[PDB]
Amino acid sequence: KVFERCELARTLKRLGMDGYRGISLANWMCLAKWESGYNTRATNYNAGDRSTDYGAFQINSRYWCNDGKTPGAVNACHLSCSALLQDNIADAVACAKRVVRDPQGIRAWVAWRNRCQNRDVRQYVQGCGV
């Protein structure tokens, strides 16, 4: 499913993402935007290390979810990577919360550093009523 901007913004707020571990809702929106374009079925294979990024937040199979074919992989979210491809983003949100519970926080995603850090992210939530 490809979410519309404000639709996703409201859903994330309902799931308690606003201010989670100090991360504002606009930052989560900036991350989803650049990672997948708000697309829950997005997958990207990383030929260089044999891991795959899954879903709206592009969560990696080496550390977060299990897809069975990633070498030396752990499953910190204790989920099948398949769960991160559903239209209902509840599981992907719970796993995203787990990722930011690590010391790096939101910095765990390189795209956040490149496209969101130190920038005016208000545009991602403006007019959505959140």
Curated annotation (Swiss-Prot):
EC code: 3.2.1.17
Reactions catalysed, as given in the entry: Hydrolysis of (1->4)-beta-linkages between N-acetylmuramic acid and N-acetyl-D-glucosamine residues in a peptidoglycan and between N-acetyl-D-glucosamine residues in chitodextrins
Gene Ontology terms: cellular component: azurophil granule lumen; extracellular exosome; extracellular region; extracellular space; specific granule lumen; tertiary granule lumen
Domain of life: Eukaryota
One Pfam family matching this protein: Lys
Biological processes annotated in GO: antimicrobial humoral response; defense response to bacterium; defense response to Gram-negative bacterium; defense response to Gram-positive bacterium; inflammatory response; killing of cells of another organism
Subcellular location as annotated: Secreted
Active site: E35, D53
GO MF, one example: lysozyme activity
Stretches assigned to the C-type lysozyme domain: 1-130
Cystine crosslinks: C6-C128, C30-C116, C65-C81, C77-C95
Presence of the UniProt keyword Glycosyltransferase in the record: no
Keywords per UniProt: Amyloid, Amyloidosis, Antimicrobial, Bacteriolytic enzyme, Disease variant, Disulfide bond, Glycosidase, Hydrolase, Secreted, Signal
Subunit structure: Monomer.
Protein task: Lysozymes have primarily a bacteriolytic function; those in tissues and body fluids are associated with the monocyte-macrophage system and enhance the activity of immunoagents.
Comment field (misc): Lysozyme C is capable of both hydrolysis and transglycosylation; it also shows a slight esterase activity. It acts rapidly on both peptide-substituted and unsubstituted peptidoglycan, and slowly on chitin oligosaccharides.
Family assignment from sequence similarity: Belongs to the glycosyl hydrolase 22 family.
Disease involvement: Amyloidosis, hereditary systemic 5: A form of hereditary systemic amyloidosis, a disorder characterized by amyloid deposition in multiple tissues resulting in a wide clinical spectrum. AMYLD5 primarily affects the viscera, and the predominant clinical features are renal dysfunction of varying severity, and intra-abdominal bleeding. Inheritance is autosomal dominant.
Name of this chain's protein: Lysozyme C
Organism: Homo sapiens (Human)
Name of encoding gene: LYZ
